[PDB]
Amino acid sequence: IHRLSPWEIPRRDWFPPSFLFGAATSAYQIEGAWNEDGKGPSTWDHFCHNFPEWIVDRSNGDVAADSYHMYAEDVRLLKEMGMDAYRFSISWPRILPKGTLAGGINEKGVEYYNKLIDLLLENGIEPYITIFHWDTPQALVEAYGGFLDERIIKDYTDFAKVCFEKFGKTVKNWLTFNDPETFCSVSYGTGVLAPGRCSPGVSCAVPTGNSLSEPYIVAHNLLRAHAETVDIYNKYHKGADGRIGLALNVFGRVPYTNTFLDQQAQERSMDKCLGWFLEPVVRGDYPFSMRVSARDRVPYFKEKEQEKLVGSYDMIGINYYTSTFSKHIDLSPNNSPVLNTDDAYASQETKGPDGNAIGPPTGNAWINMYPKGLHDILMTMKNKYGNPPMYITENGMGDIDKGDLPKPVALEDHTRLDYIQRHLSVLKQSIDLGADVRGYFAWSLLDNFEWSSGYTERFGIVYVDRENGCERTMKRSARWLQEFNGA
Amino acid sequence: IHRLSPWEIPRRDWFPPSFLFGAATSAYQIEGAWNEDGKGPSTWDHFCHNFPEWIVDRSNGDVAADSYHMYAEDVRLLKEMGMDAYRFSISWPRILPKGTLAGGINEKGVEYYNKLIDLLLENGIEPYITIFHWDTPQALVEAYGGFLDERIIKDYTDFAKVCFEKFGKTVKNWLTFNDPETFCSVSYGTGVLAPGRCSPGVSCAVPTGNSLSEPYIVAHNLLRAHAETVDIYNKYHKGADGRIGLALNVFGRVPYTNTFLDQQAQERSMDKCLGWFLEPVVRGDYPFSMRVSARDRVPYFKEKEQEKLVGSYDMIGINYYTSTFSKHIDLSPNNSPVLNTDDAYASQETKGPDGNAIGPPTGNAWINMYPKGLHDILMTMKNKYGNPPMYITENGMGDIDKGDLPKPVALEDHTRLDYIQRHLSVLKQSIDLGADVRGYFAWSLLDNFEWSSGYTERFGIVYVDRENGCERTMKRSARWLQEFNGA
Ligand SMILES: N#C[C@@H](O[C@@H]1O[C@H](CO)[C@@H](O)[C@H](O)[C@H]1O)c1ccc(O)cc1
Ligand SMILES: N#C[C@@H](O[C@@H]1O[C@H](CO)[C@@H](O)[C@H](O)[C@H]1O)c1ccc(O)cc1
């Protein structure tokens, strides 16, 4: 693998003194303790326990990184690395086992996050809390289909309210949703992720949904929940320095050729990924291209919530992993959309017209290394969407572990270190070109449960040893980050 | 009126030695002799004779500029002005009174154009012939609704064939259609122009058409006719130096603000005007934006004709008069397209967001003076569509004559001269920036019948005196052009 020359390797003062460096996790992927201390089941419990064959290694998050119990080790590692901040998520059904206020607040759940938050702040690490990361209380699915019904909105905002009340005095940085596009397209469109729904004829666990309509329904409910939650926060919790936003996953998209049809395809593709959630919070409606394509499958916001939607963010999280080429597909009698993503009339190609991959594989099936893509997205944010305050809230890659990765080999994560150095170098170029980015969070602090891939992909800068009690060991990437942070 | 400074006034050698300067007319607008020498009625005869109240001054083209009889004066004026070329059109029903080959070729019709062509070439003026300028044989409308039926295609190509056979040995520059967008949207959409059709509830002479579907039907038939005609020409007539194309009218479109929604509106607007005809001849299909918006109202080309369509031009004519701002309209349950142009989801505003007109009025109801718009269109042609060889095949403006314009005042057309100088100055900037433009034709050589405006708008560089036998007198603009051409 070809590394950056020594003088091209980023140094901490490439970035402003106030810039944040951190790492990120999510509740289901690290916590474990899935049935402990009163916690209710989430969709991810239900999915792993009923459809184990839909996880590639038949694994689950019953234990994960055992962070419910081992959270003090999590904080120790962040401190030793010199991190300024930490993104973690709250487990909805750990706080409200039945999903609702009326089912009761689980105080053991609450105390857990309270201890975590206290420990981080005692060590000078600023918490950035994500309220929801795909782990809907299964009881809400039992009651009404969860995000498939507008009833979700009140339960979500009740949940957010509990979070703001219990933690808001100490936590000033909030994100309502994380990767809403992945959540909608992949949990309800291709059905890869819990609850695993898709159209008849699509291969997924529960092929009785509708890959053309459900992703939009769920997206719409989540956006209404977001607008309302931001309104609650602004009215009752923001005060002098509180901030709330959301974190979007954005694939970079490069026109397959520099020809108008493929440029137009790239634009529809960006609209269908970034614009789907960003344009609603920025201007109060979905991108024109999405409506004109999918028509009555895209719902309309009501007047009052629409006013709440517009500008409903203090900052936007960008989670960036990779890019593809976007190639035009003609509208013809021969093309009939199957998945919501087909509404973009574009194919996403990993190989360009000269036969070359966009960039090299980093290990897993989809993350190709293309740091220039981040620059393209940030210039779009800066020039098209008003340059809001941004955080790279996730950036990382997975090492494959199919049972023959010796720990010593796992610790020498040179590919990951190169990946991180190169994205930081591009990020420096973006900030110098005026993009308002204020921090960077590696995905992930810990090797963890990588959804349908189970434990076969390790994304951590810290190794979690499943054969040794989930003991943590800094990888070389974490050691580099420690030197970089001057710690 | 504020004129260019003397050193900013264009001189002939601003332009290449091989560059062409000319003027243009069309058959119905200048010829008169509407029922003479065997000529059949066109739709424009029929419209003026049945719906005189739909011409603002209740006038018609029975005589027009009397150019069927006075054509030798037309040629004299072109020669004295030093013009290199002349664009005129052939009257379909003057060549085939019944519209069809089977109804017979009108030899008196043929001899007329033959004399005109001989006289031009004797005087060193290159003819650029337009085959069709909106004057469909009324007999074809009687037989099958003319352009509303695919039967038009064979009759048109038969007509084109007669033209190529009779004139092609001496004429090497052909244009199949002129302003196909105006022809479709305005004759079948707003119904202002013959045959005056529109949807019930739209104000026009024959409000029993459909302003949402007929413009597309007619456009589609004209494009199929074009592809087939170019194929005939290339196979049997082109030889070593023959050239065939078409001339498109293009409004400049400026985004109402430099904001993504209005930029997107500007792009849809350009697609709906320029791209509607240019993208078919360039790539073999309509712009994506037009299909995704109007769906089943836009027909599909067949495989074989589509192959003929792609690249079916040696040069593209640009007829440019004016620009507007294009402002975004949202797709909502409240918006329902009435006219085909509503499919662009954009309003065309003559006033921008600061309250200023895009440019000043030149006289009539729609031509605002905005020469920078031509530059924008030419850069689009150069950068987006491959920079094909281009001619400004029309450019001009009208002086209002409602019966109180003394001839001496009409001759001092300073507004027109300023308009021409300023567009030539912008054209110089475009050519210097690499646009492949090879000539410029003023609309019009002669004051003429300006369609629904009748004789109330004079567009000529040469005055045609209706009170003095249609005698011709060069206006100041023509005198400037004469000095410019060094003649
Ligand atoms: N985009 C994306 C992926 O998810 C986000 O990135 C992490 C690495 O994949 C993941 O662990 C994290 O939870 C997410 O924020 C993604 C993951 C899985 C599937 O099927 C699609 C996308
Ligand atoms: N665009 C346009 C107008 O037509 C073209 O320009 C000339 C001046 O208007 C006209 O005389 C010529 O025949 C055309 O090539 C146009 C004219 C009338 C109406 O109603 C709409 C557009």
3-state secondary structure chain A: CCCCCHHHCCCHHHCCCCCEEEEECCHHHHCCCCCCCCCCCEHHHHHHHHCHHHCCCCCCCCCCCCHHHHHHHHHHHHHHCCCCEEEEECCHHHHCCCCCHHHCCCHHHHHHHHHHHHHHHHCCCEEEEEEECCCCEHHHHHHHCHHHCCCHHHHHHHHHHHHHHHHCCCCCEEEEEECHHHHHHHHCCCCCCCCCECCCCCCCCECCCCCCCHHHHHHHHHHHHHHHHHHHHHHHCCCCCCEEEEEEECCEEEECCCCHHHHHHHHHHHHHHHHHHHHHHHHCCCCHHHHHHHHHHCCCCCHHHHHHHCCCCCCEEEECCCEEEEEECCCCCCCCCCCHHHHHCEEEECECCCCCECCCECCCCCCECCCHHHHHHHHHHHHCCCCCCEEEEECCCCEECCCCCCHHHHHCCHHHHHHHHHHHHHHHHHHHCCCCEEEEEEECCECCCCHHHCCCEECCCEEEEHHHCCEEEECHHHHHHHHHCCC
How crowded is the C-beta side of A70, counted as CA atoms within 13 Å? 18
The 3-class secondary structure across A441-471, one letter per residue, is EEECCECCCCHHHCCCEECCCEEEEHHHCCE
Kindly compute the dihedral angle of the four CA atoms of residues B43, B48, B54, B58, in this order, to the nearest 10 degrees: 160
Q: CA–CA separation, B364 vs B284, rounded Å?
A: 36
B22: helix, strand or coil = strand
Instruction: Give helix B152-167 / helix B214-236 axis angle, nearest 10°.
Output: 40
Cα A154 to Cα A91, A164, B109, B360: the distances in Å are 17, 15, 79, 56
| DSSP class per residue in B25-54 | --HHHH---TT-TTPPPBHHHHHHHH-GGG
Q: CA–CA separation, B176 vs B161, rounded Å?
A: 11
Q: Enumerate residues 6+ apart whose C-beta is below 8 A from B414.
A: B1, B3, B476
Token pair belonging to A303: 């007047």
Residues in chain B followed by a break, C to N above 2.5 angstroms:
none
Q: Is A310 buried (19+), middle (13-18) or exposed (0-12) by CB count in 10 A? A: middle
Token pair belonging to A244: 């709330």
Q: What angle do CA A60, A66, A68 make, to 5 degrees?
A: 115
Q: CA–CA separation, A318 vs A378, rounded Å?
A: 9
Token pair belonging to A136: 């809907």
B430: helix, strand or coil = helix
| B345/A292 Cβ within 8 A | yes
Experimental approach was: X-ray
Cα A104 to Cα A39, A107, A155, A158, A275: the distances in Å are 11, 9, 12, 11, 37
Sheet containing A346-349: order of strands:
A252-255, A323-328, A346-349
Q: Enumerate residues 6+ apart whose C-beta is below 8 A from B461.
A: B23, B81, B396, B413, B416, B442, B444, B445, B474, B475, B477, B478, B481
B71: helix, strand or coil = helix
Token pair belonging to A38: 């009163």
| A288/B331 Cβ within 8 A | yes
Do the strands A390-394 and A323-328 form a parallel or antiparallel pair, or are they unpaired?
Answer: unpaired
Q: CA–CA separation, B56 vs B134, rounded Å?
A: 19
Q: What angle do CA A470, A474, A477 make, to 5 degrees?
A: 135
Nearest to B462 by CA among B66, B11, B78: B78
Q: What number of other Cβ atoms are within 10 A of residue B182's Cβ?
A: 19
How crowded is the C-beta side of A4, counted as CA atoms within 13 Å? 19
Q: Given CB atoms, is B258 within the 8 Å cutoff of chain A?
A: no
B/e letters for A388-411, b = 16+ CB within 10 Å, e = fewer, are bebbbbbbbbbbebeeeeeeeebb
Q: CA–CA separation, B73 vs B474, rounded Å?
A: 11
Q: Enumerate residues 6+ apart whose C-beta is below 8 A from A13.
A: none
Specify whether the CB–CB gap between A211 and A294 falls below 8 A: no
Specify whether the CB–CB gap between B75 and B120 falls below 8 A: yes
Helices (H), B210-259: 214-236
Specify whether the CB–CB gap between B282 and B386 falls below 8 A: yes
Reported for A206-211, long-range contacts at CB under 8 A and 24+ positions apart, including other chains, are A211/A338, A211/A339, A211/A340
B24: helix, strand or coil = strand
| A283/B330 Cβ within 8 A | no
The one-character DSSP state at B271 is I
Annotated catalytic residue within A181, A214, A279, A394 = A394
Nearest to A66 by CA among A446, A361, A358, A339: A446
Please list the residues that pair with B390 across neighbouring strands: B316, B437
Q: Taking CB atoms and an 8 Å cutoff, what residues of chain A touch B299?
A: none
B368: helix, strand or coil = strand
Specify whether the CB–CB gap between B57 and B456 falls below 8 A: yes
* φ and ψ at residue B2, rounded to 5 degrees: -90, 115
Amino acid in position B335: N
Amino acid in position B2: H
Q: CA–CA separation, A94 vs A98, rounded Å?
A: 9
Q: CA–CA separation, B182 vs A398, rounded Å?
A: 58
Q: CA–CA separation, A91 vs A41, rounded Å?
A: 10
Q: What number of other Cβ atoms are within 10 A of residue A38's Cβ?
A: 15
Specify whether the CB–CB gap between A231 and A223 falls below 8 A: no
Q: Taking CB atoms and an 8 Å cutoff, what residues of chain A touch B330?
A: 285, 288
Instruction: Give helix B67-80 / helix B107-122 axis angle, nearest 10°.
Output: 10
Max CA pair span of chain B: 63
Q: CA–CA separation, B339 vs B300, rounded Å?
A: 20
Q: Enumerate residues 6+ apart whose C-beta is below 8 A from B244.
A: B174, B175, B176, B229, B230, B233, B234, B238, B313, B314
Nearest to B260 among A261, A345, A384 (CB): A384
B113: helix, strand or coil = helix
Cα(B186) to ligand 2 centroid in Å equals: 10
B/e letters for B160-170, b = 16+ CB within 10 Å, e = fewer, are bbbbbebbbee
Q: Given CB atoms, is A260 within the 8 Å cutoff of chain B?
A: yes
Please list the residues that pair with B22 across neighbouring strands: B85, B441
* φ and ψ at residue A17, rounded to 5 degrees: -50, -40
Q: CA–CA separation, A188 vs A134, rounded Å?
A: 12
Task: Measure B250 CA to nearest chain A CA, in Å.
Answer: 19
Q: CA–CA separation, A171 vs B11, rounded Å?
A: 72
Instruction: Give helix A180-187 / helix A276-283 axis angle, nearest 10°.
Output: 130
Q: Residue written as tokens 């040696």? A: B314
Cα A280 to Cα A310, B46, B404: the distances in Å are 7, 53, 57
| DSSP class per residue in B276-304 | HHHHHHHHSS--HHHHHHHGGGSPPPPHH
Q: Given CB atoms, is A366 within the 8 Å cutoff of chain B?
A: no
Specify whether the CB–CB gap between B425 and B369 falls below 8 A: no
Beta strands in B48-142 (DSSP E): 85-89, 126-132
Q: Taking CB atoms and an 8 Å cutoff, what residues of chain B touch A345?
A: 288, 292
* φ and ψ at residue A451, rounded to 5 degrees: 45, -130
B9: helix, strand or coil = coil
Amino acid in position A484: F
Q: Given in angstroms, what resolution was this structure solved at?
A: 2.0
Token pair belonging to B446: 């002669």
Q: Residue written as tokens 């999280």? A: A317
Q: Given CB atoms, is B332 within the 8 Å cutoff of chain A?
A: yes
What is the fold, at CATH topology level, of the domain defined by B1-487? TIM Barrel (3.20.20)
* φ and ψ at residue A67, rounded to 5 degrees: -70, -20
Token pair belonging to A64: 């994960």
Instruction: Say whether the peptide bond before residue A444 is cis (omega within 30 degrees of 0).
Output: yes
Please list the residues that pair with B472 across neighbouring strands: B464
* φ and ψ at residue B392, rounded to 5 degrees: -75, 95
User: If you compute the radius of gyration of chain A from its CA atoms, what whole number of angstroms results?
Assistant: 21
Q: CA–CA separation, B395 vs B259, rounded Å?
A: 30
Please list the residues that pair with A463 across neighbouring strands: A473
| A345/B300 Cβ within 8 A | no
Q: Enumerate residues 6+ apart whose C-beta is below 8 A from B265.
A: B255, B256, B326, B327, B328, B329, B344, B345, B346
> Number of A:B CB contacts under 8 A?
37
The sign of the dihedral angle between the CA atoms of A439, A445, A448, A453 is: positive
